Amino acid sequence: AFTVDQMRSLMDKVTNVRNMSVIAHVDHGKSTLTDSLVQRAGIISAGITIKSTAISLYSEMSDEDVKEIKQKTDGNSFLINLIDSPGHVDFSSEVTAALRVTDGALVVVDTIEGVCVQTETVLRQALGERIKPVVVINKVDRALLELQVSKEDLYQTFARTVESVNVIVSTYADEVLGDVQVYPARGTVAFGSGLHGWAFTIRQFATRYAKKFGVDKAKMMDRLWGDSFFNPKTKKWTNKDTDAEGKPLERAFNMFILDPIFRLFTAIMNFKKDEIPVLLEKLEIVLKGDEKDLEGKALLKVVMRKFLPAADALLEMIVLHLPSPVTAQAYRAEQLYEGPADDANCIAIKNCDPKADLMLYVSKMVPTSDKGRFYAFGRVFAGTVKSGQKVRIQGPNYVPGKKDDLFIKAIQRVVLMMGRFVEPIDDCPAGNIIGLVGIDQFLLKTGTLTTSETAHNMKVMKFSVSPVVQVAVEVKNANDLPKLVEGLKRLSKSDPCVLTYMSESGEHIVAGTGELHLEICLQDLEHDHAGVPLKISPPVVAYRETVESESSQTALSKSPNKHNRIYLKAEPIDEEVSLAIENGIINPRDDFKARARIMADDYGWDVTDARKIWCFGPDGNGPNLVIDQTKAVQYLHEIKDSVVAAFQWATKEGPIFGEEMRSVRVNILDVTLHADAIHRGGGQIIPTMRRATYAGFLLADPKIQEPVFLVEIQCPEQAVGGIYSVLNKKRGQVVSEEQRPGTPLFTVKAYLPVNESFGFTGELRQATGGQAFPQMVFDHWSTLGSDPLDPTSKAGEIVLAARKRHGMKEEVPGWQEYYDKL
Numbered sequence: 001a002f003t004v005d006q007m008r009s010l011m012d013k014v015t016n017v018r019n020m021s022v023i024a025h026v027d028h029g030k031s032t033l034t035d036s037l038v039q040r041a042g043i044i045s046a047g048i049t050i051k052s053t054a055i056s057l058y059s060e061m062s063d064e065d066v067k068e069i070k071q072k073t074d075g076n077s078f079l080i081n082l083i084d085s086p087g088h089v090d091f092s093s094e095v096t097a098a099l100r101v102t103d104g105a106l107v108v109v110d111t112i113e114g115v116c117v118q119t120e121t122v123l124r125q126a127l128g129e130r131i132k133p134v135v136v137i138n139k140v141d142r143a144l145l146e147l148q149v150s151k152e153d154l155y156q157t158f159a160r161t162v163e164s165v166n167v168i169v170s171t172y173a174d175e176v177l178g179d180v181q182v183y184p185a186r187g188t189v190a191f192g193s194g195l196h197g198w199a200f201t202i203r204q205f206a207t208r209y210a211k212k213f214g215v216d217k218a219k220m221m222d223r224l225w226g227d228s229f230f231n232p233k234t235k236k237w238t239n240k241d242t243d244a245e246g247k248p249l250e251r252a253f254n255m256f257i258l259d260p261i262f263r264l265f266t267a268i269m270n271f272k273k274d275e276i277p278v279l280l281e282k283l284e285i286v287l288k289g290d291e292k293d294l295e296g297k298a299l300l301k302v303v304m305r306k307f308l309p310a311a312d313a314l315l316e317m318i319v320l321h322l323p324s325p326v327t328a329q330a331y332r333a334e335q336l337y338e339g340p341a342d343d344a345n346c347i348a349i350k351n352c353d354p355k356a357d358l359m360l361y362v363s364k365m366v367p368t369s370d371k372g373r374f375y376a377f378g379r380v381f382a383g384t385v386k387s388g389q390k391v392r393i394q395g396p397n398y399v400p401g402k403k404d405d406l407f408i409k410a411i412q413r414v415v416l417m418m419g420r421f422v423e424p425i426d427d428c429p430a431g432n433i434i435g436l437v438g439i440d441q442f443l444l445k446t447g448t449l450t451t452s453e454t455a456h457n458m459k460v461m462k463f464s465v466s467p468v469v470q471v472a473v474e475v476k477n478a479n480d481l482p483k484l485v486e487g488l489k490r491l492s493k494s495d496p497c498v499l500t501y502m503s504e505s506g507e508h509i510v511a512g513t514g515e516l517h518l519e520i521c522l523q524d525l526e527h528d529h530a531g532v533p534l535k536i537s538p539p540v541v542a543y544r545e546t547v548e549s550e551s552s553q554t555a556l557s558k559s560p561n562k563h564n565r566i567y568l569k570a571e572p573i574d575e576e577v578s579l580a581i582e583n584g585i586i587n588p589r590d591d592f593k594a595r596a597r598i599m600a601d602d603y604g605w606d607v608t609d610a611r612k613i614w615c616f617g618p619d620g621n622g623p624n625l626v627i628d629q630t631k632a633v634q635y636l637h638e639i640k641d642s643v644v645a646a647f648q649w650a651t652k653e654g655p656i657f658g659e660e661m662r663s664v665r666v667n668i669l670d671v672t673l674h675a676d677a678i679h680r681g682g683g684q685i686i687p688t689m690r691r692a693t694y695a696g697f698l699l700a701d702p703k704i705q706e707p708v709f710l711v712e713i714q715c716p717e718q719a720v721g722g723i724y725s726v727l728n729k730k731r732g733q734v735v736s737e738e739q740r741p742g743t744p745l746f747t748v749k750a751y752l753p754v755n756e757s758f759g760f761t762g763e764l765r766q767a768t769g770g771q772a773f774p775q776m777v778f779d780h781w782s783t784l785g786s787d788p789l790d791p792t793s794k795a796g797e798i799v800l801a802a803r804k805r806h807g808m809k810e811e812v813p814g815w816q817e818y819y820d821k822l
């Protein structure tokens with residue numbers, strides 16, 4: 001327990017500060033180990049509550065051991081900050097940002113299950129941020145009490161684990177740090193049981209056995225591990241697992257360390273009453289009061305704790321081997337700064353200089369009971385933040401040349417994040433971890449607070465600023481529609497990042513930056529902007545009705561007089577052309593000379609068609625045509641207006657299910673009209689044309705076309721695999737994967753069926769730890785090979801569902817009901 005003054009004092013000596021976190025796979029013991037640490041070293045102040053993000057630990061070392069510290073030191077006291085980052089192990093972004101404020105890690109590894117997958121994934125992440133590790137093989141009790149392991153066996157398991165780790169380390173750690181591998185002999189690997197409350201390091205033993213009988217420790221600890229043996233008989237040290245007579249010799253580690261431990265377990269767990277007292281007498285393990293009447297487990301726990309207090313071993317490695325802000329910021333400053341390595345600020349970070357311009361990294365915002373408020377949490381890398389001081393909050397985006405929506409505000413208060421409690425402080429010098437009240441609105445998630453103008457931003461998580469999620473929105477009571485329409489306009493004004501629009505299928509669509517963004521946009525819309533009961537739903541997809549080939553036989557249809565008859569056929573127009581029609585290159589409003597040249601010379605159509613085309617449909621200019629290939633027909637030109645209108649009709653709503661036609665060309669092969677106008681007017685022709693087209697259409701191997709998005713995702717070469725996994729489950733098709741010379745992030749491009757997209761952006765982030773950054777756009781129509789008229793096929797399923805939704809007959813009228821024989 002300390003006072004704000006006491007605390008502030010600890011903060012001045014940043015050489016004696018340790019910023020770290022416990023890295024561990026699930027269930028390996030991280031929670032219990034940290035509590036172990038908190039119970040002995042945890043710090044308190046001597047009602048606002050917050051979500052614990054970090055804890056302060058206090059540890060004082062001996063004048064001697066303090067000399068074992070190969071790094072600038074000042075005093076015997078140390079302030080250790082145990083940062084906490086346990087959510088979604090996969091989400092590398094979320095994690096990395098958090099690990100970024102630490103300089104060291106206590107890597108935990110189970111004795112039995114050793115180094116595994118989740119383990120090396122976090123260890124590799126750490127190395128990524130240039131963090132130095134130390135290991136603790138935990139749950140050693142498990143190996144004994146359960147597996148009945150033998151001394152040489154256990155040693156082997158440890159050696160194995162230690163070796164595995166180092167592979168990960170050397171194979172990935174930067175050379176700019178020097179061999180950062182872990183060595184049991186050098187005291188950077190601990191062994192113990194977090195649960196039972198005991199652990200040890202080679203150093204602890206070597207040091208003890210180093211004064212009991214004056215002998216140097218450095219030398220001694222090198223022997224207490226590896227292939228060094230001590231022949232009891234010869235009274236000498238050997239490097240041979242066999243003596244002169246070739247006879248077996250016991251390893252130093254097993255002889256002087258493991259053995260004492262193994263004996264204590266046997267003598268206790270076997271209730272050997274007589275040996276216990278003496279065994280304890282030789283190890284100098286003194287028990288008090290009632291403790292002398294414990295048995296088995298209950299006694300073993302008490303003894304081991306008194307013998308090898310787990311805290312001491314862990315605290316030792318942290319103080320003697322994990323770097324101080326000073327030591328680390330020197331070789332970590334590069335990566336932490338987006339700007340030039342010679343910049344003023346980048347150099348301050350290098351120097352953990354408190355007198356410089358502020359370089360404060362906001363790691364994340366944290367929820368408090370201070371009424372919806374969030375205190376900013378992070379590290380002061382350069383300069384010193386002060387309560388009141390004005391600061392330049394620099395968002396994820398910001399750049400020194402653009403007002404870029406910066407934010408120059410005043411730190412309402414600087415505070416210590418003591419677990420669930422905060423304590424007001426005046427200022428805080430570089431190298432410390434700290435919390436800030438008053439930046440709730442100006443920033444969300446990562447950020448940077450500088451006091452300089454040339455000051456660039458520090459390496460923070462990047463954002464998603466493209467519309468990647470959307471839903472259709474409808475009012476529940478028809479009469480509120482105008483309120484929804486007005487609300488949608490309001491929503492947009494108040495939010496530069498929201499997008500609203502009308503779907504081809506007449507729906508109000510609202511798209512957001514990510515799921516959460518969308519969620520609030522909807523809440524805001526329903527209860528504020530429009531204030532009306534809404535109905536959110538997956539938007540309805542539009543399809544196109546087309547033909548795969550020409551009518552298998554002339555389509556014939558007689559008017560309701562039986563007087564007039566149309567013989568036509570249909571065939572598929574080419575995509576290139578439909579596209580030209582659609583993009584306005586082949587336009588109905590252009591002079592004929594222009595249109596004629598284009599279709600004949602650039603799109604290779606017969607030079608005589610352009611003059612026979614009667615119209616484009618639907619709406620006069622759609623990618624569908626009526627070419628008059630008749631001949632001796634007398635009054636052929638008297639019905640033109642009717643045929644055109646009938647065409648504008650059939651193309652707006654095809655026969656498969658009322659969707660627009662696309663790429664359809666109808667050839668009016670022949671017509672046998674009447675002689676008098678009385679029996680050929682509108683009412684008689686339209687019905688014949690319309691009907692005959694449907695007949696032609698249906699007879700031309702009809703098909704449906706589905707809309708398809710073009711999606712572009714930028715993501716880390718590692719997570720790039722998730723992109724593929726999701727896309728495979730959604731009929732997606734990869735178009736290209738292009739590398740970036742410096743591996744800052746590959747960019748994958750692929751086609752994703754629109755009807756295969758609801759929830760995609762969400763699934764993408766899940767399969768990539770939010771590492772992938774998508775953006776998508778409508779790109780093209782694509783014919784489905786399946787048969788639209790067979791309810792079982794993908795297409796038939798679609799049509800079925802559609803007709804159903806529409807309240808149409810579920811069955812699709814075959815061509816015959818449109819065809820007219822004899």
Ligand SMILES: CO[C@@H]1[C@@H](C)O[C@@H](OC[C@@]23C[C@@H]4[C@H](C)CC[C@H]4[C@@]4(C=O)C[C@@H]2C=C(C(C)C)[C@@]34C(=O)O)[C@@H](O)[C@@]12OC(=O)[C@H](CCCCCCCC(=O)O)O2
Nearest residue numbers: 467469470503504539541542707758759760761776777778
């Ligand atoms: C500039 O905004 C664009 C916006 C105006 O139009 C969008 O495409 C809309 C389209 C546009 C085309 C053409 C007009 C012809 C056929 C229609 C469609 C019919 O089904 C096919 C498309 C999807 C529709 C609906 C299902 C919503 C469409 C429609 O009916 O309008 C995209 O082109 C747009 O670009 C963006 O960047 C954000 C992307 C939103 C992506 C949502 C992805 C969903 C993933 C998830 O929810 O997980 O939106």
Ligand SMILES: Nc1nc2c(ncn2[C@@H]2O[C@H](COP(=O)(O)OP(=O)(O)O)[C@@H](O)[C@H]2O)c(=O)[nH]1
Nearest residue numbers: 025026027028029030031032139142193194195
């Ligand atoms: N036998 C044994 N069990 C342990 C030890 N440390 C933790 N456990 C148990 O392992 C499980 C997971 O531990 P916990 O610390 O919550 O794991 P974490 O998910 O890594 O934080 C719990 O049931 C613990 O009680 C240990 O040293 N020995």
